[PDB]
Amino acid sequence: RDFNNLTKGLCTINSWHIYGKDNAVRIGEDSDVLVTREPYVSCDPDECRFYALSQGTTIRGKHSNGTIHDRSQYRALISWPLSSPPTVYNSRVECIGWSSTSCHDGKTRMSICISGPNNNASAVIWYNRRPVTEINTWARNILRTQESECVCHNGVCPVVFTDGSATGPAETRIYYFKEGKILKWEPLAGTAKHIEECSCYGERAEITCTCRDNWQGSNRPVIRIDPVAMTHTSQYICSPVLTDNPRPNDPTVGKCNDPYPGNNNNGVKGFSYLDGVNTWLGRTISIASRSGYEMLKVPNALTDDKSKPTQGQTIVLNTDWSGYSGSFMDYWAEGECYRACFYVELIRGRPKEDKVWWTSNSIVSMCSSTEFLGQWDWPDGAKIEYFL
Amino acid sequence: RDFNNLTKGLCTINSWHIYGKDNAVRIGEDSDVLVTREPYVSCDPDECRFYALSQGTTIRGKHSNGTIHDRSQYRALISWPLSSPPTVYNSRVECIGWSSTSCHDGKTRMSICISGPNNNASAVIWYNRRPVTEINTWARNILRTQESECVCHNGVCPVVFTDGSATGPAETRIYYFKEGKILKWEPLAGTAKHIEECSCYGERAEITCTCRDNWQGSNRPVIRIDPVAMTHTSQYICSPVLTDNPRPNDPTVGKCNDPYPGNNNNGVKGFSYLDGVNTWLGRTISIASRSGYEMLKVPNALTDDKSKPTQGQTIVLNTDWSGYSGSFMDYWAEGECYRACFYVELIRGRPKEDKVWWTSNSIVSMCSSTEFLGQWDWPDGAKIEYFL
Amino acid sequence: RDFNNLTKGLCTINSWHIYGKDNAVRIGEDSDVLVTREPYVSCDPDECRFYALSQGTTIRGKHSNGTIHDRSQYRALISWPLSSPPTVYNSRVECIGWSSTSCHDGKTRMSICISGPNNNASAVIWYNRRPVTEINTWARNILRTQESECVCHNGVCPVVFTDGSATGPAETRIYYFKEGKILKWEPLAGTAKHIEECSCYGERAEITCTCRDNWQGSNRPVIRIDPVAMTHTSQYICSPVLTDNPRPNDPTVGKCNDPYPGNNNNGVKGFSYLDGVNTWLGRTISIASRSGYEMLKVPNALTDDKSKPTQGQTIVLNTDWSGYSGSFMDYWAEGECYRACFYVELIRGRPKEDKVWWTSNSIVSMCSSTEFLGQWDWPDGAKIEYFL
Amino acid sequence: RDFNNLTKGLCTINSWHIYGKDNAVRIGEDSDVLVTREPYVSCDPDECRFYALSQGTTIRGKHSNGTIHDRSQYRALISWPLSSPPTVYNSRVECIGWSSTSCHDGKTRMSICISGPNNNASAVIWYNRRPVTEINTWARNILRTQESECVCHNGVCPVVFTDGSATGPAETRIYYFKEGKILKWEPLAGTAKHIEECSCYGERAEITCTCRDNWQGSNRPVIRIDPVAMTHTSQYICSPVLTDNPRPNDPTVGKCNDPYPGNNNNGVKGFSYLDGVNTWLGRTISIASRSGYEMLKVPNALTDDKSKPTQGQTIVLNTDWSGYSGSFMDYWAEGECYRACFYVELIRGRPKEDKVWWTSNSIVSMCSSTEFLGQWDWPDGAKIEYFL
Ligand SMILES: *[C@@H]1O[C@H](CO)[C@@H](O[C@@H]2O[C@H](CO)[C@@H](O[C@@H]3O[C@H](CO)[C@@H](O)[C@H](O[C@H]4O[C@H](CO)[C@@H](O)[C@H](O)[C@@H]4O[C@H]4O[C@H](CO)[C@@H](O)[C@H](O)[C@@H]4O[C@H]4O[C@H](CO)[C@@H](O)[C@H](O)[C@@H]4O)[C@@H]3O)[C@H](O)[C@H]2NC(C)=O)[C@H](O)[C@H]1NC(C)=O
Ligand SMILES: *[C@@H]1O[C@H](CO)[C@@H](O[C@@H]2O[C@H](CO)[C@@H](O[C@@H]3O[C@H](CO)[C@@H](O)[C@H](O[C@H]4O[C@H](CO)[C@@H](O)[C@H](O)[C@@H]4O[C@H]4O[C@H](CO)[C@@H](O)[C@H](O)[C@@H]4O[C@H]4O[C@H](CO)[C@@H](O)[C@H](O)[C@@H]4O)[C@@H]3O)[C@H](O)[C@H]2NC(C)=O)[C@H](O)[C@H]1NC(C)=O
Ligand SMILES: *[C@@H]1O[C@H](CO)[C@@H](O[C@@H]2O[C@H](CO)[C@@H](O[C@@H]3O[C@H](CO)[C@@H](O)[C@H](O[C@H]4O[C@H](CO)[C@@H](O)[C@H](O)[C@@H]4O[C@H]4O[C@H](CO)[C@@H](O)[C@H](O)[C@@H]4O[C@H]4O[C@H](CO)[C@@H](O)[C@H](O)[C@@H]4O)[C@@H]3O)[C@H](O)[C@H]2NC(C)=O)[C@H](O)[C@H]1NC(C)=O
Ligand SMILES: *[C@@H]1O[C@H](CO)[C@@H](O[C@@H]2O[C@H](CO)[C@@H](O[C@@H]3O[C@H](CO)[C@@H](O)[C@H](O[C@H]4O[C@H](CO)[C@@H](O)[C@H](O)[C@@H]4O[C@H]4O[C@H](CO)[C@@H](O)[C@H](O)[C@@H]4O[C@H]4O[C@H](CO)[C@@H](O)[C@H](O)[C@@H]4O)[C@@H]3O)[C@H](O)[C@H]2NC(C)=O)[C@H](O)[C@H]1NC(C)=O
Ligand SMILES: CC(=O)N[C@H]1[C@H]([C@H](O)[C@H](O)CO)OC(C(=O)O)=C[C@@H]1NC(=N)N
Ligand SMILES: CC(=O)N[C@H]1[C@H]([C@H](O)[C@H](O)CO)OC(C(=O)O)=C[C@@H]1NC(=N)N
Ligand SMILES: CC(=O)N[C@H]1[C@H]([C@H](O)[C@H](O)CO)OC(C(=O)O)=C[C@@H]1NC(=N)N
Ligand SMILES: CC(=O)N[C@H]1[C@H]([C@H](O)[C@H](O)CO)OC(C(=O)O)=C[C@@H]1NC(=N)N
Ligand SMILES: *[C@@H]1O[C@H](CO)[C@@H](O)[C@H](O)[C@H]1NC(C)=O
Ligand SMILES: *[C@@H]1O[C@H](CO)[C@@H](O)[C@H](O)[C@H]1NC(C)=O
Ligand SMILES: *[C@@H]1O[C@H](CO)[C@@H](O)[C@H](O)[C@H]1NC(C)=O
Ligand SMILES: *[C@@H]1O[C@H](CO)[C@@H](O)[C@H](O)[C@H]1NC(C)=O
Ligand SMILES: *[C@@H]1O[C@H](CO)[C@@H](O)[C@H](O)[C@H]1NC(C)=O
Ligand SMILES: *[C@@H]1O[C@H](CO)[C@@H](O)[C@H](O)[C@H]1NC(C)=O
Ligand SMILES: *[C@@H]1O[C@H](CO)[C@@H](O)[C@H](O)[C@H]1NC(C)=O
Ligand SMILES: *[C@@H]1O[C@H](CO)[C@@H](O)[C@H](O)[C@H]1NC(C)=O
Ligand SMILES: [Ca+2]
Ligand SMILES: [Ca+2]
Ligand SMILES: [Ca+2]
Ligand SMILES: [Ca+2]
Fold this sequence. Notes:
Oligomer: homotetramer
Membrane topology (chains A, B, C, D): Single-pass type II membrane protein
Keywords (chains A, B, C, D): Calcium, Disulfide bond, Glycoprotein, Glycosidase, Host cell membrane, Host membrane, Hydrolase, Membrane, Metal-binding, Signal-anchor, Transmembrane, Transmembrane helix, Virion
GO biological process, one term (chains A, B, C, D): carbohydrate metabolic process
Number of strands of chain A: 23
Bound molecules: a molecule of 6 linked components (NAG-NAG-BMA-MAN-MAN-MAN), zanamivir, 2-acetamido-2-deoxy-beta-D-glucopyranose, calcium ion
Family (chains A, B, C, D): Belongs to the glycosyl hydrolase 34 family.
GO molecular function, one term (chains A, B, C, D): metal ion binding
């Protein structure tokens, strides 16, 4: 109908309830399930779907060998029904590429896929399932984007791109699209030193993204965007509760405008909901690998450099593999407020489980509840020995 | 369009005709069929679908090993087209959980799934395919529900929940939902001592549920609900024709307000249509196991403590496995009256057929006819030896 | 919209062109294709679909063993997209049964399935995908019907049923349904001695059915129905070109009101288009088995007891297996006349190819052309050796 | 709604971006993917789909043996969702045949399939998924058509057919269809000596087709059609940049009205966009086999007999297999101009890779961009050794 506007604030998050789980690897042991990674969830006004970057082969197929690799001509952004596994027969291809983002503006959906060699990549913006705009690499070093949904307000959908070094200063740009066309783009501003894979959500006409500083920060950079004025700023989450991975152990005081040192040249896509005392951070339990997953309520984490957890919820036990995580919300649900949601990618295979030659994942997603619900852990559930 | 109202009475049931049969296990021997249990049937104004609790694996898949277990993070309520098998590719996930119920109110469908650890479970109510309300465990002992469809009248859909001991007194509540929100809830009232897995239907603005007394009764408890006043009462079916399983042999006189003794701490979900002389009871033929299935016309079974069968129909021969059974009706069919229907779960595998390591089922469903139709038996049809 | 009326006459048939072919057995050698038999084609106002009686198992599945049998609790009438194979995932179940018919009346579709033991079978009439009417066996000896589409005119859809002996006089009835309800039924009238599996079509407010006299005729009985007056009559096709199978060799003069002797207690479902000089008969090439298939133009075959072919078209070579054949037309196609069509069931497996333990089929269908098109043969295409 | 009219001109082509890729062979190694060849892409006003000629078997199925053959009764024109593989379960059959074309006129789609023996073939024209017109062979020697989409203007859709010798003069006709009926047909006019498999596109009320001279030309014939006047003419592309295969090496000067000699009795379907200086030609890199694929900007290639490349883009490396290629455009996309697109068939198996007994393909498609995007190569991606 008309363009969606971010007119509501976030609901109070007292706990998280189970939303969707596909059990892809369990089912894929004996079904035609596509090998994937970098999944996410995104909603249309009438349906919410699972999304991911396919590797162009099934798990049981011989071409699954070598799927640990990130970029190839055989990947594609695919979407499929909520909680179903990504199968060959029920998956819909959005575009061809090894990095992506996608969001509905209220009228129709925009999907962006980046493909190419490392030094000659390009993004093609699709709108209403047709290619509309193309952007060539500007720093000639792996043009990349969010790997989770973008957000729109009155037709304008900002998207964060990064091109250049992953272990040094790079060139990040914020593009403001409307109906697939570029209205404007800015270079990154603020105090963030490195930006990659931003996880965004919107409320009260403002868009907040929690990204990944791959170069030096263990605390996460944040970009706040004003989609009306088409401007932005960046900083780091102040809290000592560090959320990247790998990372040092938590200190007693954090850093607001500088990366917290400890781990270099590595990280993981993550997210957070920054809403005053209604603030929740997600993170792997392990400080060394993508293992376990928990949510921690850290009041004023964004601005308080000494803030520590007041409540928490374990999503995946530390004995189980996790991976990327990002944010999404059903902006078309009924209600007085936006219910915060998130997904966790559960990676199986290489590099950790090297008895198999593939790398894939399943998905688990939760949304917030105003009740204080009991918790359960949500592992992938596949027994790797069954694949030998 | 508008909320459905239970304005009709039941059609005269002179016999039962075949409605749907999926042959899931036969087909699943060489197809990507999901392992399930606790199935049921539910109608929307334009289509009737099969429902069940998936185990998150196919029958032929290696993860089918251990599917005898009731609760895990890999189960989900799924629905699929009438008489098709529950396949990986044609199944739609309604919600994540190991216990459920679901019903259409005329405008849209409400689905409820309960998940969690035994002592920290929670129910999340979905309406129009979006989560709306959440309820945390109140007795911290396996919060559970119907495992068959609920029923609505002018927007109000009562649902019976039980939390607490399965072998002792528990806390049963009747929740009255409207558009996924809680209007009110009551503690169980009346003479029923234990309630579990209620099978409900509605007619002339009243909802009747035939449940399971797992603790001590071999006769079934009944809950009658008034969805307008939002009140209820309970008692037991008076008839000496006992319908739980396992159970003692039929006596000459039954009990109206007390459980009929004989078997303790066990049972099976079942149902009945209580309509004066137009009363039919369903039951396993075997008094010891979930074997065989028959329908018996027992006039005034609800109030006559000496009532015995006047007519009958064998659905499944005693040499064949049966299982859960419940009620449903197409409230949107044309006609002067509601045609009574029911389904029978046909369990294959463990614990009875222990040569295989899995437990699954197929479904058979019948609806009433005013004609006196000839009978046939409807077994699962799978030869277990084919799975070794 | 409104009920369809048979207001047109048949187009001139100068030859036949290929309409649909599913190659089910070829594809089913390595795909989840259901085992079937007794297929047919039927159109809705917006789509034409393939129909058949499933055996409730795939061809490669172990339960395919024994599918030569006609009646069991595992059969169901299924429909699927034109020219696709009947797969587990794309097939829609219309009803449960081992004998059927189905037709669209312009508003919605009626499907009838008969199930039961030989001496206690029953038909349940579905309309708009809901059961509406049920009919119990009247002669207690395999209640059976058309096995191809029925035809409607202004809401009235006659259907021919037969109950009783297949090798002696039986009780045939013509039921006139409207919206799934019985308006009236008649006992068979005219000179036909035995009727089974009628293949019907309609034109200019009259319905013609070419059936099978299993008892003694090698010439086919014909039933002409007036759907307005709801009356009918029957006779045999006069032509010496015999069309049942098995059958004696063609004589020089046929029989109009008596069965032509030669073969007893056997036959095959077939059809014909009887339209004065625009008359075409279909038949197996072999007089001994269901092998080969050809169409022969035999002017005035219905009334001329000496009529012989004036033109012909080979559909399946005598070295290839054929089987049942029946008529259907797209009554909703644009145009001044109804284009005659037909399908041929291509049976593979038992009893002829006994190296395999199953029996299944694929389908080929053609429609008429006013051009004189070149001919090609259309075999099943599967190599049985590939299934050992 | 209404018939589409070719009112726009072509967008400026500065480079090509990736549009769709199905990775059919990679996925088909362990999925129910149909064996195909002769693919193409065609758009409806609301969706663009992949099309191809099925061989009626899956790649892994035993019937894939011998699929190198061109014509059989088991082929069919099938369509499926963009970038998905052609699977047994998601493919839609358009018609039965071993040669085809198809296009949407704005209101509905016309599909044409030719089937038959070499000396008695026939084309049946389908419109709105119903057969409407039939044309019998005129030269009795493999009646054949485009093997890529046709184009319409105000309801009129010209289609080029060829019947007769492939190594000598043949009879080519241009049929002008409207709603599936023949308005008129012409014999080939102009200087082209042999025409086969025309690849067409339209702009500013004119339709241009780049075909294949199988008899003697290494330069391609071109047919320009005026769909309003229903007339046409033909010539050869003047440029010395030869685009058929096999072919001699490029000369310094080409031929405008004669075939350029060098290779006899062979070729490959190809295409070009002829638009003054905005002219791009596609061709295999290899002059000997269907290997590699590149696009070359050759200003005024159609009329300048000395024109040479000014820019280029490699699509498939010469070390990778290619095959047929053709044109298509989304005439229903928003915008001021028509964005040129094309597809490349990537043949795997026989005759080049003879370790397997089958022949199939996958598809890659690109559309033009006004940006100068970086290039990447797009191979099939399957490792043949995995099929042994
Ligand atoms: C029924 O359901 C309800 C709902 O779930 C259950 O109640 C919930 O129970 C939770 C578990 O106790 C409880 O969560 C905890 O809440 C406290 C705040 O009250 C929070 O501090 C906890 O978080 C710390 O502890 C966990 C381990 O338990 C750590 O993994 C987590 O990261 C937090 O500790 C780490 O970070 C802190 C901040 O920097 C450090 O101070 C601390 O030393 C520790 O640091 C180390 O570990 C880090 C991670 O490995 C590492 O990075 C760092 O470098 C150090 O090495 C936790 O969230 C819920 O609040 C509670 N919910 C409610 C409503 O009550 C109930 O029990 C269930 N019933 C039953 C029977 O189970
Ligand atoms: C063509 O089709 C028609 C339609 O189906 C056929 O006619 C039908 O035929 C049915 C079979 O005879 C007939 O059903 C029977 O009807 C009588 C009432 O008239 C009913 O009592 C029968 O039910 C008892 O018998 C069956 C065994 O046959 C038991 O399984 C059942 O539970 C009933 O008996 C048990 O419960 C009773 C009540 O307490 C006890 O009195 C009795 O002793 C017995 O108890 C033991 O068994 C129990 C179960 O194991 C156990 O719990 C208990 O503790 C004891 O150990 C049955 O329903 C239909 O009424 C009839 N329909 C019509 C319209 O006529 C026709 O025959 C078909 N034609 C052909 C050739 O087959
Ligand atoms: C390009 O395409 C066109 C279009 O197809 C081709 O032209 C067509 O060619 C057809 C083949 O010649 C031709 O069909 C024939 O037409 C004649 C009438 O003109 C018709 O009689 C033929 O039918 C008899 O013959 C076939 C065997 O060829 C039999 O199978 C068939 O049943 C008919 O014969 C049997 O029945 C008769 C009637 O009772 C008996 O008189 C006769 O003896 C025979 O009886 C025995 O066989 C029976 C079946 O086994 C058995 O029951 C009985 O008891 C006896 O044992 C046939 O239809 C088309 O008419 C013609 N079409 C046109 C428009 O011209 C053209 O050739 C193609 N080009 C090339 C190069 O192939
Ligand atoms: C990042 O991305 C951009 C965009 O892709 C990259 O820039 C592009 O780079 C391309 C590669 O250099 C460049 O394409 C070339 O452009 C020139 C015109 O400037 C064009 O002539 C080239 O085409 C010839 O060369 C290729 C081999 O490289 C041949 O395969 C091709 O057919 C052309 O040569 C043949 O035909 C000519 C005409 O007849 C003959 O003169 C010539 O001798 C040769 O003939 C032989 O080969 C034929 C084919 O086998 C055979 O039939 C014949 O008989 C003879 O045997 C080519 O298209 C793009 O123009 C350029 N794009 C832009 C916007 O700049 C950039 O490099 C990327 N960055 C990095 C680091 O890679
Ligand atoms: C464009 C690209 O390849 N992005 C990478 C990403 C990247 O390596 C880091 O952010 C550092 O630059 O890391 C990872 C990762 O698992 O850490 C997966 C992403 N894979 C894919 N998006 N395909
Ligand atoms: C919540 C739960 O696990 N319910 C159980 C149910 C339960 O054990 C009895 O009612 C006694 O409490 O029994 C059975 C059963 O087969 O008897 C299956 C149900 N399984 C599932 N709903 N998953
Ligand atoms: C109801 C029934 O079983 N009908 C039979 C039919 C029947 O045997 C003859 O007409 C003689 O009565 O023959 C055959 C047959 O192949 O000849 C298949 C049918 N199979 C099925 N409809 N399932
Ligand atoms: C009708 C027909 O069979 N056309 C052939 C085509 C033909 O051989 C040449 O154009 C010369 O006539 O060549 C080829 C080919 O790969 O070269 C495939 C086509 N295959 C199919 N369309 N099925
Ligand atoms: C969003 O706001 C604009 C005006 O700012 C309005 O045109 C549009 O309709 C609004 N969207 C919705 C969904 O109401
Ligand atoms: C996978 O590929 C590697 C590298 O090509 C090879 O060594 C290994 O054996 C392969 N594993 C399997 C299961 O094919
Ligand atoms: C149900 O009853 C209410 C009034 O009690 C009415 O608003 C509603 O439309 C009725 N439902 C239907 C389907 O007529
Ligand atoms: C199933 O699992 C059990 C317990 O882990 C094991 O003993 C058994 O061998 C397994 N059966 C199969 C067929 O894998
Ligand atoms: C069929 O005829 C009846 C009147 O005899 C009419 O009501 C109906 O609309 C007609 N059907 C169509 C499709 O026109
Ligand atoms: C099929 O079943 C028969 C009879 O039960 C048996 O003899 C035969 O061996 C079976 N064939 C196969 C392939 O299982
Ligand atoms: C195409 O042109 C004709 C008149 O020449 C017009 O009737 C038709 O509507 C036009 N098509 C569109 C899509 O506007
Ligand atoms: C394929 O068929 C040929 C010819 O019939 C035969 O020689 C060859 O062995 C077959 N190949 C396979 C893999 O079946
Ligand atoms: Ca980092
Ligand atoms: Ca009990
Ligand atoms: Ca006969
Ligand atoms: Ca050539």
